[PDB]
Design a protein around this ligand. Structure first.
Ligand SMILES: *Cc1ccccc1C*
Ligand SMILES: [Cl-]
Ligand SMILES: [Cl-]
Ligand SMILES: [Cl-]
Ligand SMILES: [Cl-]
Ligand code: NA
Lengths: 119, 12
């Protein structure tokens, strides 16, 4: 649709899937994650979108690794969404990948200053 | 060589 993650708009399905299958075969202890700013977010940008993440990384650990790349100030709030839902704090990144990776074998996560996606 | 477009994350 017209509301679609930007990475999927710029790379077609079969090309994405081929890279997802290859990187999962080459680095089976990590999971490929596409990280993008939510559309209506008022927040700093990330240098890159494509991350290889240890499966055993906690969600809270992942939050901090992205926060320090955005260079947020202490008073700046940060929220993450998988299919419009904030992940449970008890999840690992491998768990989110296993539950929610798309058919191209990427896991998509969005970040925002707001607590509701695209508010 | 397959990772020129991928950044690897880690925790100490
Ligand atoms: C995928 C990869 C290979 C070697 C060094 C760093 C990274 C992210
Ligand atoms: Cl989408
Ligand atoms: Cl295609
Ligand atoms: Cl770091
Ligand atoms: Cl600060
Ligand atoms: Na869990």
């Amino acid at each position: 649709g017209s509301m679609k993650f930007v990475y999927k708009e710029e790379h077609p399905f079969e090309k994405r899937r081929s890279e997802g299958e290859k990187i999962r075969k080459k680095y089976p202890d990590r999971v490929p994650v596409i990280v993008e700013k939510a559309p209506k977010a008022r927040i700093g940008d990330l240098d890159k979108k494509k991350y290889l993440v240890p499966s055993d990384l906690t969600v809270g650990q992942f939050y901090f690794l992205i926060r320090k790349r955005i260079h947020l100030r202490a008073e700046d709030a940060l929220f993450f969404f998988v299919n419009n839902v904030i992940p449970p704090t008890s999840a690992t990144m491998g768990q989110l990948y296993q539950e929610h990776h798309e058919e191209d074998f990427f896991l998509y996560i969005a970040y925002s200053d707001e607590s509701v996606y695209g508010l | 060589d397959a990772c020129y477009t991928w950044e690897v994350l880690a925790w100490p």
